[PDB]
Amino acid sequence: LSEQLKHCNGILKELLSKKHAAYAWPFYKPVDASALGVHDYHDIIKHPMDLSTVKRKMENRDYRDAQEFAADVRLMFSNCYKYNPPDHDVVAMARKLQDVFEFRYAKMPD
Ligand SMILES: C=CC[C@@H](C(=O)NCC)[C@@H]1N=C(c2ccc(Cl)cc2)c2cc(OC)ccc2-n2c(C)nnc21
Numbered sequence: 230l231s232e233q234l235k236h237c238n239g240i241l242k243e244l245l246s247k248k249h250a251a252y253a254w255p256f257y258k259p260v261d262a263s264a265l266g267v268h269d270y271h272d273i274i275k276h277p278m279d280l281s282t283v284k285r286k287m288e289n290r291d292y293r294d295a296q297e298f299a300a301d302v303r304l305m306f307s308n309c310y311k312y313n314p315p316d317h318d319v320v321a322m323a324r325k326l327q328d329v330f331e332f333r334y335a336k337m338p339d
Contacts (some may be wrong), residue, residue, distance in 0.1 A: 232338055233295040238287055240333050245280060249329060252322040256280050256305060273312055278305040295337065302330055 230238065244253060259279045262270040271277075283301050292298045309323040 230290070231294070234287075234292060234298065236337055237292070237295050237298040237334075240330060241280070241284060241287060243333065244326065244330060245284070249326060252325040253280075255319055255322060256309075256326065260308075267312070270312060274308045276304060276308075278302075278308060280305070299334060306330075 243249070245257070256279055258281050259277055260267075260270060260274075262268065278301055283298070283305070286292060286301070287298070306323050306327050310320060313320050
């Protein structure tokens with residue numbers, strides 16, 4: 230990995246760690262629309278994303294730069310905001326986790 234992508238991998242480890250598990254767990258695996266009963270999810274969200282998919286792409290060295298990594302993580306959060314009403318518990322959780330991501334991502338090295 231490039232030096233910037235190592236920082237990205239370190240953020241990803243933190244997002245999956247026990248410290249943040251109370252609000253991060255909804256984002257661990259892909260949305261199973263049938264299991265959750267949200268039969269309109271794939272009509273509204275055209276590009277699903279989740280942390281296990283980000284992790285698999287990083288493992289296979291599939292990100293070209295830090296920007297591609299950030300776009301996926303932000304996609305994951307934007308899907309959550311797009312589908313759900315603003316006062317929903319899961320949107321608060323997404324908020325909370327995204328503040329962890331954005332704060333540490335802003336500390337990128339040269
Ligand atoms: C995709 C389904 C929509 C949400 C839902 O279940 N109900 C609202 C109509 C759902 N809520 C949640 C959710 C709702 C309440 C609380 Cl406290 C935590 C998560 C959700 C749950 C999961 O369990 C394995 C996985 C993905 C979730 N998720 C994401 C991500 N964005 N919305 C959700």
